[PDB]
Every structure is written in structure tokens, then in C-alpha cells.
Amino acid sequence: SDFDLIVVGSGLFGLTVAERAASQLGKKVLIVEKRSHLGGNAYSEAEPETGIEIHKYGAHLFHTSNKRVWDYVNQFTAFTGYQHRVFAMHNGTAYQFPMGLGLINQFFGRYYTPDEARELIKEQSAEIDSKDATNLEEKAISLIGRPLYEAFIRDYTAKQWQTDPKELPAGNITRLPVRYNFDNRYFNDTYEGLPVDGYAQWLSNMADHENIEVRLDTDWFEVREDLRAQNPEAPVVYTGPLDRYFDYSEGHLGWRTLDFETEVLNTGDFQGTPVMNYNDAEFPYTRIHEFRHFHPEREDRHPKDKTVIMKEYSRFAEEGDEPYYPINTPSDREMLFKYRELADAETESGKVYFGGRLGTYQYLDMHMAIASALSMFDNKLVDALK
Amino acid sequence: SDFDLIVVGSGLFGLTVAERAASQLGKKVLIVEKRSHLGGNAYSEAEPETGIEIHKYGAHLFHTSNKRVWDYVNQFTAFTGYQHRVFAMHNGTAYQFPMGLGLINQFFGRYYTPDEARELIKEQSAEIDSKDATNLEEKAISLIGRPLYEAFIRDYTAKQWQTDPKELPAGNITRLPVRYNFDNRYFNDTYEGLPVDGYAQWLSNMADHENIEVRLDTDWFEVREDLRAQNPEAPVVYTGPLDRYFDYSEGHLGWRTLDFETEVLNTGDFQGTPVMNYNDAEFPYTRIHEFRHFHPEREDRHPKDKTVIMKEYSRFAEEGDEPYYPINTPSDREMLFKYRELADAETESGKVYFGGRLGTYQYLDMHMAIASALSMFDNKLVDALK
Numbered sequence: 026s027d028f029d030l031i032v033v034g035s036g037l038f039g040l041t042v043a044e045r046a047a048s049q050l051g052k053k054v055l056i057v058e059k060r061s062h063l064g065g066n067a068y069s070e071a072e073p074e075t076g077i078e079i080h081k082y083g084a085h086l087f088h089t090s091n092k093r094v095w096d097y098v099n100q101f102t103a104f105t106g107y108q109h110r111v112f113a114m115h116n117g118t119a120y121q122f123p124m125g126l127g128l129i130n131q132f133f134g135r136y137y138t139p140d141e142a143r144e145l146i147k148e149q150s151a152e153i154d155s156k157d158a159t160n161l162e163e164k165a166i167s168l169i170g171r172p173l174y175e176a177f178i179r180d181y182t183a184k185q186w187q188t189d190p191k192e193l194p195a196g197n198i199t200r201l202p203v204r205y206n207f208d209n210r211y212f213n214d215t216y217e218g219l220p221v222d223g224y225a226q227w228l229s230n231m232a233d234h235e236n237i238e239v240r241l242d243t244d245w246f247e248v249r250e251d252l253r254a255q256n257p258e259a260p261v262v263y264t265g266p267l268d269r270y271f272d273y274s275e276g277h278l279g280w281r282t283l284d285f286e287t288e289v290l291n292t293g294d295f296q297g298t299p300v301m302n303y304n305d306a307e308f309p310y311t312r313i314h315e316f317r318h319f320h321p322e323r324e325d326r327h328p329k330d331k332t333v334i335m336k337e338y339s340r341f342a343e344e345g346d347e348p349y350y351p352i353n354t355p356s357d358r359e360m361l362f363k364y365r366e367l368a369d370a371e372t373e374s375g376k377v378y379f380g381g382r383l384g385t386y387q388y389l390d391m392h393m394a395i396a397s398a399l400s401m402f403d404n405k406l407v408d409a410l411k
Numbered sequence: 412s413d414f415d416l417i418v419v420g421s422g423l424f425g426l427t428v429a430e431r432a433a434s435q436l437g438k439k440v441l442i443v444e445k446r447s448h449l450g451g452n453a454y455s456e457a458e459p460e461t462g463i464e465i466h467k468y469g470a471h472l473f474h475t476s477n478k479r480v481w482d483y484v485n486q487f488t489a490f491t492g493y494q495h496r497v498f499a500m501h502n503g504t505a506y507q508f509p510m511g512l513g514l515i516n517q518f519f520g521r522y523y524t525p526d527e528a529r530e531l532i533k534e535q536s537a538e539i540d541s542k543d544a545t546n547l548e549e550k551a552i553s554l555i556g557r558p559l560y561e562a563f564i565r566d567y568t569a570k571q572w573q574t575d576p577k578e579l580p581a582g583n584i585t586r587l588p589v590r591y592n593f594d595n596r597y598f599n600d601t602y603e604g605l606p607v608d609g610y611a612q613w614l615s616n617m618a619d620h621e622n623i624e625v626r627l628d629t630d631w632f633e634v635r636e637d638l639r640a641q642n643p644e645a646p647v648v649y650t651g652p653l654d655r656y657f658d659y660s661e662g663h664l665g666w667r668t669l670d671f672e673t674e675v676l677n678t679g680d681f682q683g684t685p686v687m688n689y690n691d692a693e694f695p696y697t698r699i700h701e702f703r704h705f706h707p708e709r710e711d712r713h714p715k716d717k718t719v720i721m722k723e724y725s726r727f728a729e730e731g732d733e734p735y736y737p738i739n740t741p742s743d744r745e746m747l748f749k750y751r752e753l754a755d756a757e758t759e760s761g762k763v764y765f766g767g768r769l770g771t772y773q774y775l776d777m778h779m780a781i782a783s784a785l786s787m788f789d790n791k792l793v794d795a796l797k
């Protein structure tokens with residue numbers, strides 16, 4: 026046949042499943058993608074005026090401690106030695122971040138040794154016991170104290186969730202967000218970096234295989250009856266929205282979205298670092314990204330006098346908005362279990378598998394999407410394609 | 412013969428020359444080393460109580476932009492992904508360092524953008540023009556201003572040189588020591604890291620070759636007549652002290668030395684970072700090293716409750732003291748040119764080549780010692796050993 030497997034969506038989940046079927050099982054794979062490009066939200070592109078690589082669906086930082094995943098992705102791209110570091114703007118000062126000896130010195134006014142900082146945090150947080158906390162605000166204060174909570178956590182959290190922290194689950198904070206050393210590496214994973222030639226080239230390489238066909242600007246729901254009629258026995262891996270697949274018969278799952286305000290400025294350097302969080306309520310955005318600093322190795326291809334920045338705004342996703350993060354209210358959880366039983370039935374009756382962020386109503390980092398795809402391949406698709 | 416080449420001293424210069432003759436020319440090499448171990452001042456060892464890797468002749472950080480050197484050293488050891496970062500203690504606060512947007516924010520009290528920081532530095536330094544500066548103090552102030560100079564440069568410099576900065580050459584500062592971004596990577600080189608299994612294992616691997624013989628606890632000047640009588644035609648590469656070789660006939664070359672005060676403390680973490688500079692005159696040492704933090708990848712072999720630190724003191728080298736850094740007074744320069752003519756004559760008459768830090772009265776980083784040895788090998792020894 027012209028194809029042995031259909032994959033709906035070309036995000037990292039779809040690309041991984043397609044590439045494994047193509048290269049490991051020698052199967053013909055048809056990828057159906059609604060957007061004008063491959064890669065899902067990880068896709069990046071050159072900004073036209075400056076040539077700087079930017080993102081339109083969020084900045085993407087790759088990091089993992091999963092060696093299988095790391096070895097896998099390096100078949101398709103090399104990675105730079107980039108290490109993510111973040112700074113936090115509070116009350117006119119840029120603080121070292123996350124909370125550690127650096128921030129503690131800057132905020133409390135003098136140097137605390139590791140042991141002295143441990144003592145300070147015990148003092149500050151003595152007010153509430155974490156076992157007695159009823160919401161996010163209290164759970165935070167129970168761990169780091171009111172001054173730190175009110176300076177670096179309260180307004181930022183309020184902006185991201187569009188909700189007062191007193192109205193959020195104590196379960197949203199599960200560990201001490203304080204380091205007792207000067208290490209400000211943002212991620213803790215064994216492997217980390219950015220694709221040397223950008224995300225678009227990486228993701229394009231994954232789909233570049235003699236056995237893989239890609240159809241862009243194609244909505245599954247508009248072509249599915251025709252495609253499956255060509256080869257009824259070919260399974261489908263669906264990574265589109267779960268609720269939309271079943272015609273919202275159990276209601277609309279709720280998502281957070283993001284607005285991005287992207288500007289080209291007439292300076293070579295706006296903030297001197299890739300990411301500046303804005304922790305104060307007076308700034309409506311949560312953080313500013315300055316894209317050139319994600320690739321300092323590209324400096325003599327970047328303009329000397331221009332730079333691209335992007336401000337990030339958080340809100341509830343309405344009709345038309347890109348769905349990014351599951352909200353997960355108990356109402357949401359409710360209709361999800363209902364959709365899971367529909368999906369499981371659809372797999373057994375129709376050979377349609379559900380995966381990915383949209384297909385399963387679950388936020389997935391890139392390495393987690395890859396791991397999840399590798400697992401579906403190993404445990405389900407190898408059998409279904411014999 | 413039992414040897415084709417004699418190398419005096421097993422520092423990185425000696426080891427490199429020995430290993431190239433042994434492996435590339437297939438020659439028998441005898442290495443004569445005065446100390447009880449290989450490696451010169453780069454040698455490291457386990458501290459007995461904790462097992463932590465420490466140095467007794469200064470902390471050693473490897474970094475280079477020379478790819479030939481990098482490829483060379485990786486034949487003998489792998490390197491960690493360690494990146495050196497330093498903090499500067501001034502008036503009870505730990506500052507981000509070197510001077511950049513971080514320090515500038517902490518010191519001047521609020522956040523300066525890259526462009527605003529450039530303006531600030533222009534204002535502060537307007538006082539003296541660098542072309543009009545007569546000493547180190549003025550040259551520094553002419554570049555960064557009095558407040559920055561007096562806080563982070565004056566006392567530190569006074570401690571290292573044991574001299575008032577007003578008495579030092581304007582030529583000691585040659586570029587703007589300020590960054591207009593938040594990058595606090597200490598070194599700017601393409602390649603950087605620490606030997607995965609320590610310096611001792613690395614340097615030992617260089618001398619580990621069927622064609623290489625090593626004699627420790629052996630002073631060249633006590634064995635040379637006997638060794639050269641065994642094979643008169645074998646050249647010598649000498650990396651011992653240049654002036655001592657010629658019986659101080661032109662006087663004693665002057666050096667700075669260092670005192671190290673090493674302590675085991677009953678805490679798992681003393682300062683939460685590998686190196687803390689002490690910029691204030693009230694502290695007699697220039698900086699404190701905490702050795703466990705150079706190898707965070709070794710954390711579950713390190714004790715949970717003990718740590719090794721080391722305080723560093725600078726002074727003029729007297730009899731008995733290890734010579735570390737050339738002073739380079741014009742008096743020193745004078746007798747050096749005289750010793751160079753003696754050395755050049757000794758090469759032509761005796762086939763003794765002079766190289767390395769001590770052999771040439773010149774400070775050399777590890778990669779610079781290697782490059783210099785690779786060059787002597789290529790341009791001199793290949794011919795002299797045919």
C-alpha cells in the first residue's frame with residue numbers, strides 16, 4: 026500500500042512514532058499536519074528583519090536525564106553547550122535565581138553561609154507548618170517565609186494562573202524551592218542544550234526518511250474517511266485534541282493559553298541575558314525573552330544594533346486561542362476519565378491510538394513526549410503493525 | 412642505548428616532550444624528576460581525612476581555545492563539563508564576578524540595562540584619561556572609576572603584589588575589565604573542564620608508555636655526569652630553573668610565591684562555591700578555595716559533613732619557598748637576556764634545550780606549556796634526534 030501507518034500531527038510525539046515505524050519496522054508512514062509547518066509548538070523560525078531564531082509558540086529549552094532519549098535525539102541534531110540561567114526582576118533589581126545564596130544575599134542585605142542560610146529559612150518559615158497549610162499561599166509561606174513569598178512568588182503566580190494564590194491547591198508546591206549554595210543552573214538534568222542549527226532543522230530531519238510522507242495544511246477530520254478507505258487496516262496514531270475527536274460529547278476540556286508580544290528593538294542588547302522574570306504585579310507580562318542570547322555562538326551572524334524580544338502573557342484559553350496547558354479542575358479531570366474510556370474503545374474498534382499533549386490532555390516536555398512515543402512504539406505499535 | 416633523550420622535570424612541558432618523542436619518534440626517554448611525584452605543580456592528591464581531591468601547589472583550572480592542544484590532552488584523560496565561576500566578597504556581601512550587570516546592580520543599588528551600564532561606566536571613569544595614567548591605580552580608575560576600583564581592585568591587587576598600586580606599571584591593565592551583560596563564565600575559552608579522574612591520573616597516563624622511564628626523587632645536577640656518560644649523544648630537555656643551571660653566575664632571578672593554609676572543617680559546605688575572592692584589606696588571604704565544589708559529579712563519594720578549604724597568601728619568594736610567578740623587574744629582565752645567551756650557547760655546545768616555566772623564566776598556563784612543548788618538539792627535537 027501507499028502507507029502502512031497514519032500519524033496525525035507532527036509534534037515531537039508524532040515525529041518520534043513516525044520515524045521509529047519508518048526506520049525500525051521499514052513501514053510507510055503518512056504524517057497529516059494541520060499547520061503550515063512540521064514540529065508542533067517546538068518549531069522555530071528566523072525573524073525576518075534580523076535573522077535571529079525565534080519561537081511563536083513559546084521558548085523551548087531542551088533538557089533530560091533520560092539517556093535513551095538523549096542518544097535518540099542526537100541522531101537528528103547536534104546540541105550546543107547552552108545552559109539555561111534565569112534572573113528575577115523585583116522592585117527595580119535583577120536577582121540571581123532560583124532562590125539560593127545569591128538571591129538570599131541580595132534580598133536580605135548581606136552574605137549568608139550555607140549553614141546560616143538554612144537557619145534563616147527555618148526562622149522565616151516557622152510561622153506555618155506545611156502539614157497545616159490549606160492553599161498555595163500558606164504552603165509557600167510554610168516553606169520559605171512571607172518576605173520571600175511576597176517578593177518572588179505571589180504576583181508571578183497570580184499572573185500565570187489569573188487567580189489569587191489563596192485559592193490554589195496546597196498541592197501545587199511539593200518541595201523546598203531554595204538552594205543552599207551559589208549554583209544558579211536553572212535545570213538539574215544530566216543533558217542539556219539547544220539544536221545547533223535550530224529546532225526547524227532538527228524536526229525536519231526527523232521526518233526526512235524515504236519511508237515518510239508529510240502532508241501539511243491538512244486537517245485529519247477533513248481527510249480521514251478518504252485516507253482510511255485507501256488502506257482500512259492501517260492504524261492511526263492521533264495526537265490532536267482528545268475532546269474534539271469525540272465531538273465534545275462529554276464537554277470542553279479547559280486550557281491555559283499564552284499571548285506573545287514580539288518586538289524588534291534598535292539596540293544590540295536589551296537585557297543582557299536570555300530570560301528575565303518580572304515578579305511584580307505592576308508588569309502585566311510574566312517574563313521577557315531576548316532570543317539572541319540563546320545562541321551566543323551565532324554572534325557574528327546576529328546584527329550589532331538590533332535585537333528581538335518577546336513579552337509573555339498568561340490567560341485562560343478561549344475559542345481561537347492556542348491551547349497550551351491543561352487547567353485540570355476536578356471538572357476537567359471528570360470529563361477526561363470519560364474521554365479515556367471513549368478513546369480505549371476507539372482503539373479496540375478502530376485501531377486509533379491516542380498520544381501526545383493534546384491527545385491525552387497532559388502537559389509534556391519534549392523529552393517526555395519522546396519517551397512516551399518510544400513507549401507507545403515499543404509496547405503497542407510493533408504488534409499492531411505486523 | 413638505554414635512552415635516546417633525557418627530560419629534566421615532569422611538569423606539563425616535560426611530559427609533553429617525553430610523550431611525543433616516545434610515541435611519535437619511537438625514542439627511549441628518561442624522565443628525571445626531583446619531587447616524589449609526576450606532574451609538577453599541576454599534580455593533585457586525595458586529602459587523607461575526606462578523600463577529596465586537592466592541590467598543594469595552587470588550584471589548577473584547565474581552559475583553552477587551541478584545538479590542537481585540546482585534542483592532544485584528550486588522548487590522556489576525559490574532562491568534565493565544569494565551568495569556572497568566581498564570587499567576590501566585599502564588605503560582607505558576595506558579589507557576582509567578574510564586573511558585569513550583576514555586580515553593577517548589586518554595587519550601585521539597582522538594575523542597569525546594558526546600554527545604561529555603558530553610560531554609567533563612561534561617567535565613572537571620565538575622571539582620568541587612560542592615555543594620561545602614570546601607574547596601575549590611575550590606569551584602573553581611568554577605565555572603571557574610583558568606587559569600583561577601590562571596592563574590587565585596590566586591596567586585592569595590593570595583597571597579590573605586596574605593593575601599593577600607585578607604584579605599579581600602568582601597563583599591568585590593558586583592557587576594560589567590565590562586561591555589559593549577565594554572563595559570569597570566568598574564562599572565555601572554547602574548551603574547558605577538569606580531568607574526570609583527577610590531575611594525578613591524567614599526568615601519570617602521559618608518562619605511561621613502553622618507551623618512557625621515570626626516575627623520581629632525582630635531582631638532575633646530582634646525576635647528570637653519570638647519565639650523559641652512558642650516552643653522550645642523547646640531547647637533554649631541561650625544565651628546571653634557568654639561573655640555577657648556570658650557577659647564578661648572573662644573579663638570582665626574582666619570583667613571587669604563595670602560602671597555602673589548608674583546613675578540614677566539620678561542615679559539608681563552607682561557602683557553597685569553589686572560589687571566593689576576599690577583596691578587603693582586613694583579610695590577609697586573597698581567596699578561599701573549597702575543593703569539593705570543583706567536582707560536584709563526585710558528591711556521593713564526598714563526605715556529607717566535612718569539607719576541605721584552603722586560604723591563599725601571596726608574597727615574595729625567599730630561599731626555601733617554591734618559585735611560582737616571575738616578578739619581571741627591569742633588573743630581572745636584565746639578567747634574563749644574559750641567561751638566554753648562556754642557554755643558547757649551551758644548546759649549541761651541549762645539546763641541552765631550555766623550556767617550561769622555570770627553564771625560561773615565564774609563567775605558563777597548562778595549555779600554553781603544552782603548546783610550547785609541541786612547538787619545541789616539532790621545530791627542534793625531531794631534527795636533533797635523527
Ligand SMILES: Cc1cc2nc3c(=O)[nH]c(=O)nc-3n(C[C@H](O)[C@H](O)[C@H](O)COP(=O)(O)OP(=O)(O)OC[C@H]3O[C@@H](n4cnc5c(N)ncnc54)[C@H](O)[C@@H]3O)c2cc1C
Pocket residue numbers: 033034035036037038039057058059060063064065066067082083084085086087088243244245246264265266283349350380381382383384388389390391392394
Ligand atoms: C508554551 C510552550 C512552551 C514549551 N516549552 C518547552 C520547553 O522549554 N521545554 C520542553 O521540553 N518542552 C517545552 N514545551 C513542550 C513541547 O512543545 C513538546 O514538544 C510538546 O508538548 C510535545 O507534545 P506533542 O508532540 O503531542 O504536541 P504538539 O507540539 O502540540 O504537536 C501536535 C501537532 O498536531 C497538530 N494537529 C492538531 N490537530 C490536528 C488535526 N486535526 N489534524 C492534523 N494535525 C493536527 C498540531 O498542529 C501540532 O503540530 C512547550 C510547550 C508549550 C506549549
Ligand SMILES: Cc1cc2nc3c(=O)[nH]c(=O)nc-3n(C[C@H](O)[C@H](O)[C@H](O)COP(=O)(O)OP(=O)(O)OC[C@H]3O[C@@H](n4cnc5c(N)ncnc54)[C@H](O)[C@@H]3O)c2cc1C
Pocket residue numbers: 419420421422423424425443444445446449450451452453468469470471472473474629630631632650651652669735736766767768769770774775776777778780
Ligand atoms: C600557583 C599556580 C597555579 C596554577 N594554576 C593554573 C591554572 O589554574 N591553570 C593553568 O592552565 N595553569 C596553571 N598553572 C600552571 C601549571 O602549573 C603549568 O602546568 C606549569 O606552569 C607548566 O610549566 P612546566 O611543566 O615547565 O612547570 P612545572 O610544573 O614547574 O614542572 C617543572 C618540574 O621540574 C622539576 N624540576 C625542577 N628542578 C629539577 C631538577 N634539578 N631536577 C629534576 N627535576 C627538576 C620540578 O620538580 C617540576 O616537577 C599554575 C601554576 C602555579 C604555580
Ligand SMILES: CC(=O)N[C@H]1[C@@H](OP(=O)(O)OP(=O)(O)OC[C@H]2O[C@@H](n3ccc(=O)[nH]c3=O)[C@H](O)[C@@H]2O)O[C@H](CO)[C@@H](O)[C@@H]1O
Pocket residue numbers: 083113177178179181182185302304390
Ligand atoms: C513544573 C514545571 O517545570 N513546569 C513547566 C514550566 O516550567 P518553568 O521553569 O518555566 O516554570 P514557571 O516560570 O512556569 O514557574 C512555575 C511556578 O513556579 C512559581 N514561580 C516561578 C518563577 C518565579 O519567578 N516565581 C514563582 O513563583 C510559580 O508558582 C509558577 O507558577 O513551564 C515550562 C515551559 O512550558 C515547562 O517546561 C515546565 O515543565
Ligand SMILES: CC(=O)N[C@H]1[C@@H](OP(=O)(O)OP(=O)(O)OC[C@H]2O[C@@H](n3ccc(=O)[nH]c3=O)[C@H](O)[C@@H]2O)O[C@H](CO)[C@@H](O)[C@@H]1O
Pocket residue numbers: 469499563564565567568571688690776
Ligand atoms: C592574566 C592572568 O590571567 N594571569 C593568571 C592569574 O589568573 P586569575 O584569574 O587567577 O587572576 P588573579 O586572581 O590573579 O587576578 C589578576 C589581577 O586582576 C586583578 N583582580 C582580580 C581579581 C579580583 O577580585 N580583583 C582584582 O583586582 C588584580 O590586579 C590581580 O592581580 O592566575 C592564574 C592562576 O595561576 C593564571 O592561570 C592566569 O594566567
Ligand code: NA
Pocket residue numbers: 150151152153154155166167168
Ligand atoms: Na514551616
Ligand code: NA
Pocket residue numbers: 536537538539540541552553554
Ligand atoms: Na577615562
